[PDB]
Amino acid sequence: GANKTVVVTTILESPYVMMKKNHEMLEGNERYEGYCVDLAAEIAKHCGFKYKLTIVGDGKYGARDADTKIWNGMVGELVYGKADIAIAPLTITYVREEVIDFSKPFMSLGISIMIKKGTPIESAEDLSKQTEIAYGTLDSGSTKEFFRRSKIAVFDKMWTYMRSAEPSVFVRTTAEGVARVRKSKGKYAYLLESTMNEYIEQRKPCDTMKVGGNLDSKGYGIATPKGSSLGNAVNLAVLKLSEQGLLDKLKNKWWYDKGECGS
Amino acid sequence: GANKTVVVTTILESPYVMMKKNHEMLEGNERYEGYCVDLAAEIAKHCGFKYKLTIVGDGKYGARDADTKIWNGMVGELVYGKADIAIAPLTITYVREEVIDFSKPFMSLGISIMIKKGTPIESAEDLSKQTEIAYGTLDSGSTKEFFRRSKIAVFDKMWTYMRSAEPSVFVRTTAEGVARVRKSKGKYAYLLESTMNEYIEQRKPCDTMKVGGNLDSKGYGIATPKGSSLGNAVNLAVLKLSEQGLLDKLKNKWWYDKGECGS
Ligand SMILES: C[C@@H]1CCCN(C(=O)c2ccc3nccnc3c2)C1
Numbered sequence: 001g002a003n004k005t006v007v008v009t010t011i012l013e014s015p016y017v018m019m020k021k022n023h024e025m026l027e028g029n030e031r032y033e034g035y036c037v038d039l040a041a042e043i044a045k046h047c048g049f050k051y052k053l054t055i056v057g058d059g060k061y062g063a064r065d066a067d068t069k070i071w072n073g074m075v076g077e078l079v080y081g082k083a084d085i086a087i088a089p090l091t092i093t094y095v096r097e098e099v100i101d102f103s104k105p106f107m108s109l110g111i112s113i114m115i116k117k118g119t120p121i122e123s124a125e126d127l128s129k130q131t132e133i134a135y136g137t138l139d140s141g142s143t144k145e146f147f148r149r150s151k152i153a154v155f156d157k158m159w160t161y162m163r164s165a166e167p168s169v170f171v172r173t174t175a176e177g178v179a180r181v182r183k184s185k186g187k188y189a190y191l192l193e194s195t196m197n198e199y200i201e202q203r204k205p206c207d208t209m210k211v212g213g214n215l216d217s218k219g220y221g222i223a224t225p226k227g228s229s230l231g232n233a234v235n236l237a238v239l240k241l242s243e244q245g246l247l248d249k250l251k252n253k254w255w256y257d258k259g260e261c262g263s
Numbered sequence: 264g265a266n267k268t269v270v271v272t273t274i275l276e277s278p279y280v281m282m283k284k285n286h287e288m289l290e291g292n293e294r295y296e297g298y299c300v301d302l303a304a305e306i307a308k309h310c311g312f313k314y315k316l317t318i319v320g321d322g323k324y325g326a327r328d329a330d331t332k333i334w335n336g337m338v339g340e341l342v343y344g345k346a347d348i349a350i351a352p353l354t355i356t357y358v359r360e361e362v363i364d365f366s367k368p369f370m371s372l373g374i375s376i377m378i379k380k381g382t383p384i385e386s387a388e389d390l391s392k393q394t395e396i397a398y399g400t401l402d403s404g405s406t407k408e409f410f411r412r413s414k415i416a417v418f419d420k421m422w423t424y425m426r427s428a429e430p431s432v433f434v435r436t437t438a439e440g441v442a443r444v445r446k447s448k449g450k451y452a453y454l455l456e457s458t459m460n461e462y463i464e465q466r467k468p469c470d471t472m473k474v475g476g477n478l479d480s481k482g483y484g485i486a487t488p489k490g491s492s493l494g495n496a497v498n499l500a501v502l503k504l505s506e507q508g509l510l511d512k513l514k515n516k517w518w519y520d521k522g523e524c525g526s
């Protein structure tokens with residue numbers, strides 16, 4: 001039938017989606033800026049659709065409750081028909097791939113460690129062998145699931161510690177984890193994706209850093225409900241933008257060009 | 264109908280597929296070893312199929328002739344029904360995605376520069392601004408297409424030079440490009456994927472090196488003919504092997520564990 005405005009679910013996560021200067025006085029998509037705001041515009045252009053950006057109601061990426069079997073976050077919004085597409089730093093994972101469709105990836109990342117500068121930690125193994133410095137992950141996302149599921153000895157040991165630590169080491173948003181690192185005088189380290197870690201490293205007050213190699217290697221993809229007719233065109237659009245160098249230009253624009261911690 | 268042996272197309276490209284010690288006396292899949300031989304076994308196991316490894320007849324990755332519109336290489340073998348799946352360092356590209364199906368990627372790479380140690384080149388821009396050192400790419404693959412298509416000034420300048428250089432700067436196989444670098448006393452640099460570059464850097468006589476950052480960022484995928492029923496299971500298998508850490512273990516096994524240029 002007739003063309004319809006595509007509902008895009010996304011998440012307020014710097015620098016992917018941020019509230020634009022003077023947003024309270026603005027309406028619709030003009031309220032937002034960031035890597036994924038730019039990426040949504042480019043995809044829409046190449047695919048020939050109009051769209052409305054919406055911020056995911058529960059502020060989550062997406063996990064399936066083992067009791068109720070219900071998905072939350074952006075994944076849930078796709079699964080239950082509340083959005084047509086997710087354009088966000090949404091990690092391609094096995095359990096998600098079973099229930100939604102994903103484009104080829106538009107950005108690579110791995111789990112990484114964020115420390116307050118000077119903290120004597122260089123690796124996951126270092127974290128796992130000490131008790132002076134607490135550490136945790138985001139709730140309802142792929143990093144927490146990575147630890148929950150890992151059979152790798154070091155990561156399994158870390159999960160056994162994290163899942164039972166009191167007070168809780170988990171946070172609801174990336175911003176909360178970053179704030180916890182910054183205020184904890186070296187006594188909290190945060191496990192988060194390299195992309196977000198490297199962004200924060202270039203933001204004032206320039207008091208955090210990424211340490212060690214990444215723990216894994218994966219990608220973010222644009223997601224649609226399983227079988228959605230939008231999927232094929234969106235996937236080709238990602239590959240076209242990749243090949244044109246536009247994704248590289250956007251990463252540079254939002255990570256480094258406006259970095260606040262020097263050249 | 265009844266289960267049938269899956270024909271796998273692949274390419275003799277170290278360390279993805281190599282001839283095993285004493286192969287002349289061996290038969291079938293036992294003739295071969297390497298990253299993709301191991302990966303094929305793992306995928307077959309998870310997907311529940313028997314398979315026969317075959318080396319692509321024309322020794323090419325795959326390009327579409329602009330005159331005849333016919334695809335060659337592994338892509339052609341899928342497109343014309345000569346193989347059921349390609350398990351190889353086959354780059355996911357837009358023009359390929361239009362004609363075959365790809366899994367999510369199993370390995371990341373970017374175009375990179377290989378030099379003979381001591382060659383005074385640090386970047387693509389360096390290459391583009393000098394005439395002492397020739398440089399080229401592999402035929403019938405994604406690297407040559409990258410330059411042919413690029414609108415980025417430096418890469419367009421490099422293509423204008425390469426496409427008309429005499430004698431030809433292009434090679435038929437990666438091994439030929441590597442040999443050309445090694446024998447040319449610094450006067451030839453080779454543009455090839457970071458994965459192959461980093462492998463060769465750890466092989467005797469340890470006379471080459473990767474210089475500069477990568478020129479782009481992309482992935483290899485497992486390919487099937489468009490619409491093949493095998494695609495869904497194979498894609499989940501890649502994600503499962505990724506998440507289990509098996510792909511990382513295999514990269515380490517074939518690149519670094521048996522590296523010949525020190526620890
Ligand atoms: C199993 C794979 C290991 C390698 C990384 N990966 C990816 O899915 C991946 C690979 C390459 C990419 N290039 C550009 C943007 N996103 C990318 C994501 C997972």
Ligand SMILES: C[C@H]1CCCN(C(=O)c2ccc3nccnc3c2)C1
Nearest residue numbers: 116117118119120132133185186187
């Ligand atoms: C073993 C470590 C426990 C945590 C504290 N340590 C640090 O190095 C450390 C690291 C960062 C800091 N930032 C502000 C104030 N104090 C700090 C102390 C030692």
Ligand SMILES: C[C@H]1CCCN(C(=O)c2ccc3nccnc3c2)C1
Nearest residue numbers: 127128129130131132133134135161
């Ligand atoms: C060194 C570890 C060996 C295994 C048993 N351990 C723990 O349960 C343990 C206890 C408290 C911690 N607090 C912060 C970070 N990690 C911790 C690990 C300590």
Ligand SMILES: C[C@H]1CCCN(C(=O)c2ccc3nccnc3c2)C1
Nearest residue numbers: 379380381382383395396448449450
């Ligand atoms: C400007 C360069 C042109 C090419 C030669 N140059 C080199 O540094 C160079 C680099 C590597 C070599 N390997 C063996 C023998 N000679 C070599 C000379 C200078």
Ligand SMILES: C[C@H]1CCCN(C(=O)c2ccc3nccnc3c2)C1
Nearest residue numbers: 390391392393394395396397398424
């Ligand atoms: C410095 C370049 C400016 C533009 C015009 N140039 C060429 O066509 C040019 C000619 C010969 C070359 N031989 C090896 C490598 N690159 C070359 C580039 C030289």
Ligand SMILES: N[C@@H](CCC(=O)O)C(=O)O
Nearest residue numbers: 061089090091141142143
């Ligand atoms: N990108 C992650 C969220 C961040 C994290 O888990 O560290 C996801 O899609 O679940």
Ligand SMILES: N[C@@H](CCC(=O)O)C(=O)O
Nearest residue numbers: 324352353354404405406
């Ligand atoms: N991986 C490339 C071949 C190597 C190259 O072009 O450098 C392809 O799939 O075409």
